Design a protein around this ligand. Structure first.
Ligand SMILES: Nc1nc2c(ncn2[C@@H]2O[C@H](COP(=O)(O)OP(=O)(O)O[C@H]3O[C@H](CO)[C@@H](O)[C@H](O)[C@@H]3O)[C@@H](O)[C@H]2O)c(=O)[nH]1
Length: 361
């Protein structure tokens, strides 16, 4: 097979959809298939040669050309579009292409927004999606009620072994014990304010605790906020994946205090693959990943009080952790690429057949 993929976000900047597309392309290639990945200009990163630029948003006429040239010349057995919102590179591809088309819907909020977007004026285009992949059972039931046609649930994958066998960072694990936070910390939905609010309760318990923070942000604004406790924060910046795996394995707890805007809990999955106990915010999607509290500890949503007690309980009580890490290590196989690439392939195969290529409208 020849798979064309579309990613609507730049690879300039880490993110769930980007990381999915790149990782999925590599896996399909490891498996013999040809992949071509289309994405917005990504000036800043070393991308493999099968990543193809769609030009940069400001999208203009050259991008509409480029999408059409790519499709028409690509000879693709399957076009796999991710997050086809409107507008976006993805929706541009969906409008330009005819034939074996598969889409993965990474984000969702509600039944309401799913019915209306799928039943809306973009309906003609959504009806061209032959294989629909959703990342939860609910999102899925939402698209089946919207368009009256089968969708499938496939959780996004990870490389479970690349976390598992990550080397610990210099001088880790820590005596004063360490907690990991990973994300664009100055978006409130990512919940840094909660972990901030619980920090005093934490520090009183482990005077030598380190809050190890991965991701881009205003370090100053947060430092000044942590007031007295700013010394306990250690910022890796926006680090590479090898380092992030290392950081994850070398932490004692992974904390996901998000407030919402999360359709799938992938960082959680990453912490489970590393063997770091997870403590998490209890958004519908996080509950699914921690399987109702059997594979990680869940905490009410905007509650720094509960969050402290939670991390405190996990850190001091070894047996409990061991059990979380054991139970979660077992469950995390469900998310590994070998499982998930299979599920996607079956979708690619339902949708394709000898002689049928993707074509320009
Ligand atoms: N190397 C590296 N990886 C990062 C960094 N920041 C994020 N990542 C990786 O980026 C991916 C996405 O995680 P987020 O940054 O938290 O999520 P998002 O892009 O803001 O949102 C999407 O992903 C969530 C994860 O499933 C979804 O819940 C959400 O709905 C959306 O689909 C994860 O694999 C995470 O490890 C970083 O600084 N460095």
């Amino acid at each position: 097979m020849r798979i064309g993929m579309v990613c609507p976000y730049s690879f300039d900047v880490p993110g769930g959809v980007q990381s999915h597309v790149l990782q999925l392309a590599e896996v399909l290639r490891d498996a013999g298939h040809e992949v071509s990945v289309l994405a917005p200009a990504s000036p800043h990163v070393k991308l493999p040669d099968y990543v193809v630029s769609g030009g940069k948003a400001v999208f203009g006429p050259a991008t509409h050309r480029k999408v059409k040239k790519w499709i028409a010349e690509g000879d693709f057995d399957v076009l796999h579009i991710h997050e086809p919102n409107a507008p976006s590179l993805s929706m541009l591809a969906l409008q330009a292409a005819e034939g074996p088309i598969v889409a993965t819907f990474h984000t969702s909020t509600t039944k309401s927004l799913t019915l209306s977007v799928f039943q809306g004026i973009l309906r003609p285009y959504h009806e061209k999606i032959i294989g629909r992949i959703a990342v939860s059972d609910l999102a899925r039931r939402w698209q089946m009620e919207a368009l009256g046609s089968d969708a499938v649930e496939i959780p996004n994958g990870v490389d479970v072994a690349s976390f598992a066998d990550a080397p610990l960072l210099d001088g880790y694990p820590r005596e004063g014990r360490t907690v990991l936070f990973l994300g664009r910390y100055d978006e409130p939905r990512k919940g840094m304010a909660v972990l901030l609010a619980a920090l005093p309760k934490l520090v009183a318990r482990f005077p030598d605790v380190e809050i190890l923070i991965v991701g881009r942000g205003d370090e100053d604004e947060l430092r000044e906020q942590a007031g007295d406790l700013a010394g306990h924060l250690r910022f890796l910046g926006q680090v590479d994946d090898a380092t992030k795996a290392s950081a994850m394995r070398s932490a004692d707890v992974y904390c996901a205090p998000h407030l919402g805007g999360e359709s799938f809990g992938i960082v959680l999955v990453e912490a489970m693959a590393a063997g770091t106990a997870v403590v998490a915010s209890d958004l519908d999607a996080f509950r699914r990943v921690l399987a109702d509290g059997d594979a990680g500890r869940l905490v009410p949503v905007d509650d720094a009080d509960g969050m402290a007690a939670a991390l405190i309980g996990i850190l001091e009580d070894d047996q409990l952790r061991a059990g979380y890490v054991a139970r979660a290590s077992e469950r995390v196989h469900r998310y590994d690429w070998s499982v998930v690439s299979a599920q996607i392939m079956r979708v690619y195969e339902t949708v394709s057949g000898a002689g049928i290529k993707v074509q320009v409208s």
